[PDB]
Amino acid sequence: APADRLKALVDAAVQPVMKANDIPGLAVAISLKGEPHYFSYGLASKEDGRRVTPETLFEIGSVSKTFTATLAGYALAQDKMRLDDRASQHWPALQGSRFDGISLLDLATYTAGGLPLQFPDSVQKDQAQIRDYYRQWQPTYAPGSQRLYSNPSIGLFGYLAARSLGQPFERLMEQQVFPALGLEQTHLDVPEAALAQYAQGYGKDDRPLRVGPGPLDAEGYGVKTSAADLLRFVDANLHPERLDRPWAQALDATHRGYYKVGDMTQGLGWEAYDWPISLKRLQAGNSTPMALQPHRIARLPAPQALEGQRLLNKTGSTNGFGAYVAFVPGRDLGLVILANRNYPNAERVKIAYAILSGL
Numbered sequence: 001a002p003a004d005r006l007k008a009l010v011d012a013a014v015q016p017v018m019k020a021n022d023i024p025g026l027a028v029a030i031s032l033k034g035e036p037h038y039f040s041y042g043l044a045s046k047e048d049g050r051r052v053t054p055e056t057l058f059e060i061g062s063v064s065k066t067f068t069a070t071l072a073g074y075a076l077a078q079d080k081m082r083l084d085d086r087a088s089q090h091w092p093a094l095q096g097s098r099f100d101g102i103s104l105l106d107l108a109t110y111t112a113g114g115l116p117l118q119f120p121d122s123v124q125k126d127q128a129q130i131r132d133y134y135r136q137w138q139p140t141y142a143p144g145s146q147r148l149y150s151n152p153s154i155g156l157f158g159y160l161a162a163r164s165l166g167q168p169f170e171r172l173m174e175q176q177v178f179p180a181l182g183l184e185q186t187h188l189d190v191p192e193a194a195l196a197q198y199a200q201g202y203g204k205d206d207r208p209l210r211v212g213p214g215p216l217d218a219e220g221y222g223v224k225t226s227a228a229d230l231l232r233f234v235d236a237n238l239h240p241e242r243l244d245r246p247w248a249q250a251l252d253a254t255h256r257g258y259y260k261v262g263d264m265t266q267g268l269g270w271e272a273y274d275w276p277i278s279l280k281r282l283q284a285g286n287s288t289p290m291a292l293q294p295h296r297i298a299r300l301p302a303p304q305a306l307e308g309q310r311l312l313n314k315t316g317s318t319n320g321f322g323a324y325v326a327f328v329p330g331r332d333l334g335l336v337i338l339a340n341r342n343y344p345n346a347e348r349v350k351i352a353y354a355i356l357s358g359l
């Protein structure tokens with residue numbers, strides 16, 4: 001009955017949203033009282049009819065920023081950097097730029113002063129173009145005043161964290177972070193031997209879409225992982241104390257809120273809400289205006305522990321994929337929803353809400 005109840009609950013949440021958004025395949029993973037549960041739907045590739053499993057690789061887009069924050073947490077834990085460090089202390093090519101006046105915290109939390117959603121199309125994945133972009137950049141407003149969701153912002157934060165550790169970002173992620181987290185199905189660059197597991201993404205007219213190279217892609221949106229591995233990451237977030245001490249500290253650094261915008265408390269990577277809260281309020285916190293418009297922040301007097309009766313979440317999108325992760329620390333509850341369509345965030349939250357309410 002409990003298997004049937006749980007399959008009934010997840011089916012009732014997922015199936016209508018998959019039909020309504022024409023999602024070819026979707027993988028759900030739930031952590032409930034320290035037990036994993038997997039629900040797999042539809043097709044990883046329509047063309048060959050490969051089915052979604054808990055080992056299928058999906059692009060998770062901006063959920064990658066929670067990994068980036070974890071590498072920064074590790075640099076913090078090892079005293080290689082501090083959140084109030086000036087950005088240019090960690091990259092000489094930025095010295096003399098406006099990044100002399102911008103903290104790592106500002107970049108991490110999108111408050112550096114109007115760094116845009118994306119690098120402009122003119123900036124390719126090239127070290128010199130990225131250096132020249134940041135050197136010439138000027139804030140639109142005061143650092144620390146307005147949140148504007150930004151790849152270049154948290155991207156630079158992860159790149160500087162990696163420089164502080166004396167190694168490239170992508171090497172640190174593959175050689176240190178993923179192994180420390182027990183993640184063997186999590187990739188920035190999918191190995192040839194694992195390509196059979198990589199789902200096809202679908203956009204308008206079902207055009208096939210896997211993410212192409214871009215400046216600080218790894219930092220902003222580069223992760224491919226399975227529902228099984230992303231739920232392991234969620235379980236590490238729910239129990240940092242089970243990891244070796246420096247990684248425990250790295251994960252705790254991602255559970256600290258610095259400011260509020262509406263119902264949302266901004267941490268490093270993770271965005272937090274009180275729990276319970278209405279579905280409409282959780283959808284609004286993950287809405288298009290929150291991604292695309294600047295918002296004045298309400299700074300907290302001291303960083304707040306993101307634990308207890310709160311929901312921590314992150315949405316992630318690429319042109320072909322739509323991911324959502326959410327966990328409730330105080331209820332030992334975790335959830336991963338990976339899909340091979342970029343379907344609206346409101347719809348991803350609709351599935352999660354139905355599941356989390358059901359439990």
Ligand SMILES: *[B@@]1([O])OC2=C(C([O])=O)[C]=[C][C]=C2[C][C]1[N]C(=O)[C][C]1[C][C][C]([N][C][C][N])[C][C]1
Binds near residue numbers: 061062220316318345
């Ligand atoms: B990220 O996934 O977060 C994000 C959301 C969200 O939170 O779900 C909504 C809207 C935008 C973003 C930004 C992030 N994702 C990307 O930046 C998408 C990425 C950008 C580069 C593209 N490549 C261009 C081709 N040369 C691929 C999509």
